Copies of this chain bind each other. A is one copy, B any other.
């Protein structure tokens, strides 16, 4: 009969997620049937005045993999009391920018790295007040002393498939208890939609096991490699045969806009990303140390995608996909986006 719907949105910090549930009379068939909702903005660092209430509008709807069918999750945009977008609602203008290049059909793919941490502040499975063995045997590893907390990974992978998230796989990363899941390919605004819901699903999955998933770019200092969010990018021109010419062109316009993307690759403006790496743009084919990498299968087939390895794990996908479209496809120049 009735249906549960968990509204999900981004709070005032640009990283955290907030959620709450409401009961519906009937099961919605599409995102447009869901009603609007509201919440207190003073409690999520989004307002601080007499008119402190904010508004929620559904943007993307997925199946709830925890309450199962016919329950739904829904990612929402945040609007202020004047019906204007909030300071952390980067999806509004990002969608408008995507609607400007609909003809080019841009496709995205981002590799979200994350680290499982216990409630004691330390990485999950790590020795208490200590370190495990040196890096090496954990990347894609198997066994009790190689992969830490695969149960969380498997549950998060089933949940994303059930919910409808376009997740292309998982893998264990070099640092122990650090994992990675790739989503894509997603067209246009649907990219940040899928990742943010995938990020929410991860946290809610970790809550069942009593662990914390951190998207910090460098959670453990030293010679423990940090967590990034490498972004694959391609449009219809780059995907058609001998489209590498437009690839090489797009990367050339990224050389003139290094600091601008760094300003849009974390919510702190490069302060968090400085921990991971940073001031030398480097582009090469299949080079892991390069800023921008073109893999082999696209290099020798002269068509495909190119990978941006700069954005950190705690980045907003809406801002990094916007920053890519304005520079590559909208040919924008200057430190500030045009207003149109």
Binding site for B on A (CB under 8 A): 2, 4, 8, 11, 16-23, 38-40, 42-45, 49-53, 66-67, 81, 119-122, 126-137, 139-145, 147, 150-151, 154, 157-158, 161, 167-172, 174, 182, 200, 203-204, 206-213, 222-223, 286-289, 295-297
Q: A131-B133, A142-B203 are in contact. Are A22 and B212 (CB under 8 A)?
A: no
The answer to whether B17 and A142 have CB atoms under 8 Å apart is: yes
Q: Are B53 and A200 in contact, with the CB atoms below 8 A?
A: no
8 residue pairs A–B, Cβ–Cβ below 8 Å: A17-B142, A21-B169, A40-B288, A53-B286, A119-B145, A127-B130, A134-B222, A142-B204
Establish whether residues B44 and A144, one from each chain, have CB atoms under 8 Å apart when the complex forms: no
The 10 closest A-B pairs by CB, nearest first: A127-B130, A20-B171, A22-B169, A127-B127, A43-B139, A130-B130, A18-B140, A53-B286, A20-B140, A143-B203
* Chain A interface SS verdict (over half): loop
Q: Contacts of A150 on B, CB cut-off 8 Å?
A: 207
Query: Does A143 contact B18, Cβ atoms closer than 8 Å?
Result: no
In the assembled complex, which residues on chain B have CB atoms less than 8 Å from the CB atom of A143?
A: 17, 203-204, 206-207, 212-213
Determine the distance from Cα of A57 to Cα of B331 in the docked complex, in whole angstroms.
39
Taken together, the copies of this chain in the complex come to 5
Please, how many angstroms separate the alpha-carbon atoms of A136 and B222 in the complex? Answer: 14
Contacts of A144 in B (CB 8 A): 119, 206-207, 209-212
A208 to chain B, nearest CB (A): 8
Chain B residues with CB under 8 Å of A121's CB are 121-122, 129
Smallest CB separation, A6 vs chain B (Å) = 9
Are A140 and B53 in contact (CB-based, < 8 A)?
A: no
Q: How far is the CA of A40 from the CA of B228 in the complex (A)?
A: 15
**Which B residues touch A23, using CB under 8 A?**
161, 167-169
19 additional contacts, CB 8 Å, given A51-B286, A53-B286, A143-B212? A20-B170, A21-B157, A21-B170, A21-B171, A23-B169, A39-B140, A43-B174, A49-B288, A119-B129, A127-B129, A128-B130, A130-B130, A130-B131, A130-B132, A131-B131, A131-B133, A142-B200, A143-B203, A143-B206
Q: How far is the CA of A171 from the CA of B2 in the complex (A)?
A: 18
Complex Cα gap A83–B44 (Å): 46
- B131 close to A128 (CB less than 8 A): no
Which residues of B have CB within 8 Å of A53? 286, 288, 295-296
Closest chain B residue to A180, Cβ basis: B20
Q: What is the bound-complex CA distance between A143 and B206, given in angstroms?
A: 7
Interfacial chain B residues near A203, Cβ < 8 Å:
142-143
| B20/A172 in contact, CB under 8 A | yes
> How many angstroms between the C-alpha atoms of A223 and B206 in the bound complex?
29
A297 partner residues in chain B, CB cutoff 8 A:
38
- Contact B67 A142, beta carbon cutoff 8 Å: no
A211 to B131 alpha-carbon distance, docked (Å):
19
Tell me the smallest distance from the CB of A75 to a CB of chain B, in Å: 13
B167-A18 in contact (CB<8A)? no
A49 touching B289, Cβ below 8 Å: yes
Contact A67 B154 (CB under 8 A): yes
Q: With A50-B289, A121-B129, A143-B207 in contact, do A136 and B295 touch (Cβ < 8 Å)?
A: no
